[PDB]
Ligand binder design. Structure first.
Ligand SMILES: C[C@]12CC[C@@H]3c4ccc(O[C@@H]5O[C@H](C(=O)O)[C@@H](O)[C@H](O)[C@H]5O)cc4CC[C@H]3[C@@H]1CCC2=O
Ligand SMILES: [Zn+2]
Ligand SMILES: [Zn+2]
Ligand SMILES: [Zn+2]
Lengths: 119, 113
């Protein structure tokens, strides 16, 4: 069974930073492209970042360029997301999702980790 | 980017109903080499999103027989032949034909009051 478990969310002050982790099990993590999708209170879903199996970012939205970093530690089977200068809009449920070659999109999703931005 | 509009936003149903939900794409999904890369996820209440169907009609791993999908171009449909309690939650269509990958406005399947 494919497992994804995010961690690192919590309360952040306006303009602070966040570092999220997602540890993977049940699959060969090093051969899969990965992504971070955030879900707002409104349940809207938005792609935050994507990375290849090689550790190279393949996507960042321009609404966050300069404040986000997606990384992976293949040996630790962990995916990371760094975000700085958090604003009120960064408040969301952050999910890590595995990228499937046949779907050309997300297959499995973690449980998500919540980031709450406070003034 | 590509907007995916889901009709209806909310769908009140009765267990055993046969329902069809819609996802309309703001741009054609046949304009390039990635023809109709339209997928459907179910976000059951309190749980994470699960892949139901990918690439219009393909049932993902673990997807019961009662789910099916159709469409080409800009209008896609997800059909549930007999709604079960396990089918309630938020349905999201998603397209991966164009960059970036985008998600739909959602269709909430809920028990009719
Ligand atoms: C994020 C993205 C939407 C999703 C696209 C995607 C979706 C699935 C996917 O699958 C990955 O395919 C590798 C391959 O092709 O060899 C296999 O090796 C991996 O095991 C598998 O994980 C790859 C890609 C690459 C481009 C991504 C786009 C970049 C911009 C964008 O919007
Ligand atoms: Zn648009
Ligand atoms: Zn959009
Ligand atoms: Zn395009």
């Amino acid at each position: 069974q494919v497992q994804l478990q995010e961690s690192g969310g919590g309360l952040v002050n306006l303009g602070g930073s966040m570092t999220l982790s997602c540890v993977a099990s049940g699959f060969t993590f090093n051969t899969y492209y990965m992504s971070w999708v955030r879900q707002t209170p409104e349940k809207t879903l938005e792609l935050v970042a994507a990375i290849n199996s090689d550790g190279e970012p393949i996507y960042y939205p321009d609404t966050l360029k300069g404040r986000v970093t997606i990384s992976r530690d293949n040996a630790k089977k962990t995916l990371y997301l760094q975000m700085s200068s958090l604003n009120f809009e960064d408040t969301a449920l952050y999910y890590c999702a595995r990228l499937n070659y046949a779907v050309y999109g997300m297959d499995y999703w973690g449980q998500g980790t919540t980031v709450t931005v406070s003034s | 980017d590509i907007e995916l509009t889901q009709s209806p936003p909310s769908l009140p149903v009765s267990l055993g109903d046969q329902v069809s939900i819609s996802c309309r794409s703001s741009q054609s999904l046949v304009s390039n080499n990635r023809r109709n890369y339209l997928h459907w996820y179910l976000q059951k209440p309190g749980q994470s999103p699960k892949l139901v169907i990918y690439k219009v009609s393909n049932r993902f791993s673990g997807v019961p027989d009662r789910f099916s999908g159709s469409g080409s171009g800009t209008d896609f449909t997800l059909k549930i032949s007999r709604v079960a309690a396990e089918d309630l939650g938020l349905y999201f269509c998603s397209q991966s034909s164009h960059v970036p990958l985008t998600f739909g406005s959602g269709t909430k399947l809920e028990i009719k009051r």
